[PDB]
Design a protein around this motif. Structure first.
Motif, PDB file in Angstrom:
ATOM      1  N   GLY D  10       0.834  -1.190   0.000  1.00 13.47           N
ATOM      2  CA  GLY D  10       0.000   0.000   0.000  1.00 13.47           C
ATOM      3  C   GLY D  10       0.870   1.241   0.000  1.00 13.47           C
ATOM      4  O   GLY D  10       2.091   1.181   0.138  1.00 13.47           O
ATOM      5  N   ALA D  11       0.211   2.387  -0.115  1.00 15.72           N
ATOM      6  CA  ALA D  11       0.920   3.648  -0.329  1.00 15.72           C
ATOM      7  C   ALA D  11       1.695   4.151   0.916  1.00 15.72           C
ATOM      8  O   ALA D  11       1.570   3.651   2.079  1.00 15.72           O
ATOM      9  N   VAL D  12       2.483   5.227   0.680  1.00 19.76           N
ATOM     10  CA  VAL D  12       3.226   5.839   1.796  1.00 19.76           C
ATOM     11  C   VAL D  12       2.293   6.190   2.951  1.00 19.76           C
ATOM     12  O   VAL D  12       1.252   6.843   2.783  1.00 19.76           O
ATOM     13  N   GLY D  13       2.692   5.793   4.146  1.00 16.68           N
ATOM     14  CA  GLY D  13       2.108   6.324   5.368  1.00 16.68           C
ATOM     15  C   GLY D  13       0.739   5.788   5.701  1.00 16.68           C
ATOM     16  O   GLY D  13       0.099   6.319   6.618  1.00 16.68           O
ATOM     17  N   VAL D  14       0.276   4.724   5.026  1.00 19.17           N
ATOM     18  CA  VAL D  14      -1.082   4.241   5.313  1.00 19.17           C
ATOM     19  C   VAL D  14      -1.154   3.444   6.599  1.00 19.17           C
ATOM     20  O   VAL D  14      -2.242   3.300   7.173  1.00 19.17           O
ATOM     21  N   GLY D  15      -0.039   2.894   7.057  1.00 24.51           N
ATOM     22  CA  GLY D  15      -0.001   2.220   8.345  1.00 24.51           C
ATOM     23  C   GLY D  15       0.423   0.767   8.233  1.00 24.51           C
ATOM     24  O   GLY D  15       0.125  -0.053   9.100  1.00 24.51           O
ATOM     25  N   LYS D  16       1.096   0.427   7.143  1.00 21.11           N
ATOM     26  CA  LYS D  16       1.528  -0.953   6.927  1.00 21.11           C
ATOM     27  C   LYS D  16       2.405  -1.428   8.073  1.00 21.11           C
ATOM     28  O   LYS D  16       2.176  -2.512   8.646  1.00 21.11           O
ATOM     29  N   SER D  17       3.431  -0.625   8.424  1.00 18.94           N
ATOM     30  CA  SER D  17       4.342  -1.019   9.492  1.00 18.94           C
ATOM     31  C   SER D  17       3.619  -1.028  10.825  1.00 18.94           C
ATOM     32  O   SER D  17       3.818  -1.936  11.649  1.00 18.94           O
ATOM     33  N   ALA D  18       2.787  -0.001  11.074  1.00 23.88           N
ATOM     34  CA  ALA D  18       2.087   0.063  12.355  1.00 23.88           C
ATOM     35  C   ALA D  18       1.191  -1.162  12.552  1.00 23.88           C
ATOM     36  O   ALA D  18       1.109  -1.725  13.650  1.00 23.88           O
ATOM     37  N   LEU D  19       0.465  -1.556  11.509  1.00 23.70           N
ATOM     38  CA  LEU D  19      -0.355  -2.773  11.600  1.00 23.70           C
ATOM     39  C   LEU D  19       0.489  -4.006  11.906  1.00 23.70           C
ATOM     40  O   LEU D  19       0.128  -4.846  12.736  1.00 23.70           O
ATOM     41  N   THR D  20       1.593  -4.153  11.215  1.00 23.26           N
ATOM     42  CA  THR D  20       2.455  -5.328  11.354  1.00 23.26           C
ATOM     43  C   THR D  20       3.057  -5.417  12.742  1.00 23.26           C
ATOM     44  O   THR D  20       3.031  -6.479  13.392  1.00 23.26           O
ATOM     45  N   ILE D  21       3.567  -4.286  13.238  1.00 23.11           N
ATOM     46  CA  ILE D  21       4.178  -4.262  14.571  1.00 23.11           C
ATOM     47  C   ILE D  21       3.135  -4.533  15.637  1.00 23.11           C
ATOM     48  O   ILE D  21       3.422  -5.155  16.671  1.00 23.11           O
ATOM     49  N   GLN D  22       1.921  -4.037  15.442  1.00 19.98           N
ATOM     50  CA  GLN D  22       0.868  -4.374  16.408  1.00 19.98           C
ATOM     51  C   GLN D  22       0.591  -5.869  16.420  1.00 19.98           C
ATOM     52  O   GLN D  22       0.444  -6.473  17.491  1.00 19.98           O
ATOM     53  N   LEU D  23       0.492  -6.488  15.232  1.00 17.59           N
ATOM     54  CA  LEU D  23       0.220  -7.923  15.185  1.00 17.59           C
ATOM     55  C   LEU D  23       1.324  -8.722  15.870  1.00 17.59           C
ATOM     56  O   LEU D  23       1.059  -9.594  16.722  1.00 17.59           O
ATOM     57  N   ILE D  24       2.571  -8.438  15.506  1.00 16.81           N
ATOM     58  CA  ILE D  24       3.713  -9.231  15.977  1.00 16.81           C
ATOM     59  C   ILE D  24       4.167  -8.844  17.389  1.00 16.81           C
ATOM     60  O   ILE D  24       4.478  -9.720  18.207  1.00 16.81           O
ATOM     61  N   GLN D  25       4.255  -7.536  17.681  1.00 18.08           N
ATOM     62  CA  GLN D  25       4.860  -7.046  18.890  1.00 18.08           C
ATOM     63  C   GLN D  25       3.895  -6.364  19.833  1.00 18.08           C
ATOM     64  O   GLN D  25       4.307  -5.966  20.921  1.00 18.08           O
ATOM     65  N   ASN D  26       2.645  -6.155  19.447  1.00 17.84           N
ATOM     66  CA  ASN D  26       1.665  -5.679  20.394  1.00 17.84           C
ATOM     67  C   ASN D  26       1.946  -4.276  20.911  1.00 17.84           C
ATOM     68  O   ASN D  26       1.659  -3.978  22.069  1.00 17.84           O
ATOM     69  N   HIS D  27       2.496  -3.401  20.092  1.00 18.62           N
ATOM     70  CA  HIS D  27       2.682  -2.031  20.538  1.00 18.62           C
ATOM     71  C   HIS D  27       2.499  -1.094  19.371  1.00 18.62           C
ATOM     72  O   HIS D  27       2.431  -1.517  18.219  1.00 18.62           O
ATOM     73  N   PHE D  28       2.306   0.181  19.716  1.00 16.06           N
ATOM     74  CA  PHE D  28       2.076   1.216  18.719  1.00 16.06           C
ATOM     75  C   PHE D  28       2.717   2.483  19.238  1.00 16.06           C
ATOM     76  O   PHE D  28       2.466   2.861  20.368  1.00 16.06           O
ATOM     77  N   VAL D  29       3.503   3.126  18.423  1.00 19.95           N
ATOM     78  CA  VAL D  29       4.033   4.460  18.719  1.00 19.95           C
ATOM     79  C   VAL D  29       3.870   5.293  17.455  1.00 19.95           C
ATOM     80  O   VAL D  29       4.119   4.811  16.338  1.00 19.95           O
ATOM     81  N   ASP D  30       3.368   6.517  17.627  1.00 16.21           N
ATOM     82  CA  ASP D  30       3.281   7.460  16.517  1.00 16.21           C
ATOM     83  C   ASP D  30       4.686   7.940  16.234  1.00 16.21           C
ATOM     84  O   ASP D  30       5.198   8.815  16.940  1.00 16.21           O
ATOM     85  N   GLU D  31       5.329   7.364  15.232  1.00 15.25           N
ATOM     86  CA  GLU D  31       6.697   7.736  14.924  1.00 15.25           C
ATOM     87  C   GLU D  31       6.910   7.665  13.417  1.00 15.25           C
ATOM     88  O   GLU D  31       6.332   6.825  12.722  1.00 15.25           O
ATOM     89  N   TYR D  32       7.792   8.532  12.941  1.00 16.36           N
ATOM     90  CA  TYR D  32       8.188   8.599  11.531  1.00 16.36           C
ATOM     91  C   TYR D  32       9.313   7.615  11.266  1.00 16.36           C
ATOM     92  O   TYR D  32      10.370   7.727  11.874  1.00 16.36           O
ATOM     93  N   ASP D  33       9.075   6.633  10.404  1.00 17.32           N
ATOM     94  CA  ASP D  33      10.073   5.614  10.089  1.00 17.32           C
ATOM     95  C   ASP D  33       9.761   4.957   8.739  1.00 17.32           C
ATOM     96  O   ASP D  33       9.246   3.821   8.686  1.00 17.32           O
TER      97      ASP D  33
END
Ligand SMILES: Nc1nc2c(ncn2[C@@H]2O[C@H](COP(=O)(O)OP(=O)(O)OP(O)(O)=S)[C@@H](O)[C@H]2O)c(=O)[nH]1
Ligand SMILES: Nc1nc2c(ncn2[C@@H]2O[C@H](COP(=O)(O)OP(=O)(O)OP(O)(O)=S)[C@@H](O)[C@H]2O)c(=O)[nH]1
Ligand SMILES: [Mg+2]
Ligand SMILES: [Mg+2]
Lengths: 169, 86, 86, 169
Positions: D10-33
């Motif tokens: 999916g496109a830039v900034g839609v939340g691909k990494s945030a979704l993945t990290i939540q699934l695997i690692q159970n956390h969320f931080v609003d951060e630019y990466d």
């Protein structure tokens, strides 16, 4: 388990692959099969210690010479092979030793000099000439024949012992 | 163009891989023939063998026998590093 | 020049690797800083960490902290294939 | 153990990494990466079956678009993510689906449509518009929020079920 990372180097056709296959697989066939790069692994007992041998079988062909600057960085010990009926392969030895030292930035790299095809009668490299060279380097010299398997174990196991001593500082 | 590829067999014979040359016009049957020659399987029927690219431990990619291998393989170049505490 | 490198840490946290950009003028301290940022170790002292290239399962290559990483790493490109019986 | 190879696109900034990290690692931080390419692995229980999830988290940035033709060949299922406050990311979805089908030479690739950032009030993509698109594709649509974690399990587990059904033919 300790693992020893061995690299077999030397000119075209000196018997690098034949030596390696004899050590690992216990067979010999007179066959034409130039090497690009082959890798082998085997668990053995040396001096009563169980260990793992990882052996990189390299290309004699100068067409692949650019690969040397890479695989030389990660070898722990080097079997430097010439054939006793191939004077040019004996003259190549010092170039392999100088490159290994350069790439590793070390004057003290585990190395063993191997004079292969000792079963042949058509000898052109004097055994005493090889012994003097190896003495001037401070390394062991072993005459081998992949065809009769004479000295195969001794060459590779002597390299392992040299590495073991280098590691023990 | 050309490149080196590492070929392994499943025979637990102490060989990890043997390298062969791959060219941009090689189609899969030719590469299979070359790989079998290299691993001393030349006397065996090539039709019984397939060519499989290893992408990762869990990811593989069978090259179809009709394909140009350069074009069908994953040609991505990756280098792996560890960030390690001293 | 530039290239992508995969960075792993030893924390058994479910991450396999995270990729970062490497450039031809990058020296080791810069790459370490970038790798730690990527794995959320920015608040930790970089001097406690080292950069290690994985060549094979048994072969590793520590990049000295004074080195240009392009020049010190093994840049050889390998592709792995299995010759498999159908 | 069965392993499922999932790819998040999916496109830039839609939340691909945030979704993945939540699934695997159970956390969320609003951060630019911004991501180039990250890979994760986790053993889970889905529908009572223990299995292994391998998740490839891909780059939205078009600068890395040449990588798509490669990683698309080895994914088993694809989470196609847009953000409900980003109309351009919704318009991108059909291009990702068309490329995946092209690279795999298959009109039937396991896919799930994910509308992320459902916690936001500044919505520009109508939910019914996303539902109609997913129906026209024959795939599930799930609204998620990596920030509240709403729908994270459902999106990834629904993709696994879709793959399982495709494998069962
Ligand atoms: N008579 C005799 N022949 C040998 C011996 N060792 C190898 N050969 C033969 O020499 C030839 C080349 O040996 P081989 O192992 O392929 O060389 P290589 O050093 O690996 O050659 P390359 O891959 O760098 S091109 C072959 O015909 C092989 O059978 C030996 O100890 N005695
Ligand atoms: N409010 C809200 N913010 C989210 C949600 N998911 C991700 N974000 C935020 O959106 C921003 C980008 O998310 P991120 O996961 O990095 O996108 P990406 O799809 O991985 O981006 P890229 O790597 O392709 S450049 C970050 O600030 C992140 O914290 C969500 O569900 N709700
Ligand atoms: Mg050889
Ligand atoms: Mg990302």
């Amino acid at each position: 388990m300790t693992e020893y990372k061995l690299v077999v180097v030397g000119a075209v056709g000196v018997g690098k692959s034949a030596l390696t296959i004899q050590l690992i697989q216990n067979h010999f066939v007179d066959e034409y099969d130039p090497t690009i790069e082959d890798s082998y692994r085997k668990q053995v007992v040396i001096d009563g210690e169980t260990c793992l041998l990882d052996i990189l079988d390299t290309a004699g062909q100068e067409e692949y010479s650019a690969m040397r600057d890479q695989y030389m960085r990660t070898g722990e010990g080097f079997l430097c092979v010439f054939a006793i009926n191939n004077t040019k392969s004996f003259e190549d030895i010092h170039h392999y030793r100088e490159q290994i030292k350069r790439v590793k930035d070390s004057e003290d790299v585990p190395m063993v000099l191997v004079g292969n095809k000792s079963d042949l009668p058509s000898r052109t490299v004097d055994t005493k000439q090889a012994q003097d060279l190896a003495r001037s380097y401070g390394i062991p010299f072993i005459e081998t024949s992949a065809k009769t398997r004479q000295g195969v174990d001794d060459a590779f196991y002597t390299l392992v012992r040299e590495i073991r001593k280098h590691k023990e500082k | 163009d050309t490149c080196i590829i590492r070929i392994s067999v499943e025979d637990n014979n102490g060989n990890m891989y043997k390298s062969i040359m791959l060219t941009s016009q090689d189609k899969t049957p030719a590469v299979i023939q070359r790989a079998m020659l290299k691993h001393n399987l030349d006397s065996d029927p090539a039709e019984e063998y397939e060519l499989v690219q290893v992408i990762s431990e869990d990811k593989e990619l069978v090259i179809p026998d009709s394909a140009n291998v350069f074009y069908a393989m994953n040609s991505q170049v990756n280098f792996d590093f560890i960030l390690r505490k001293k």
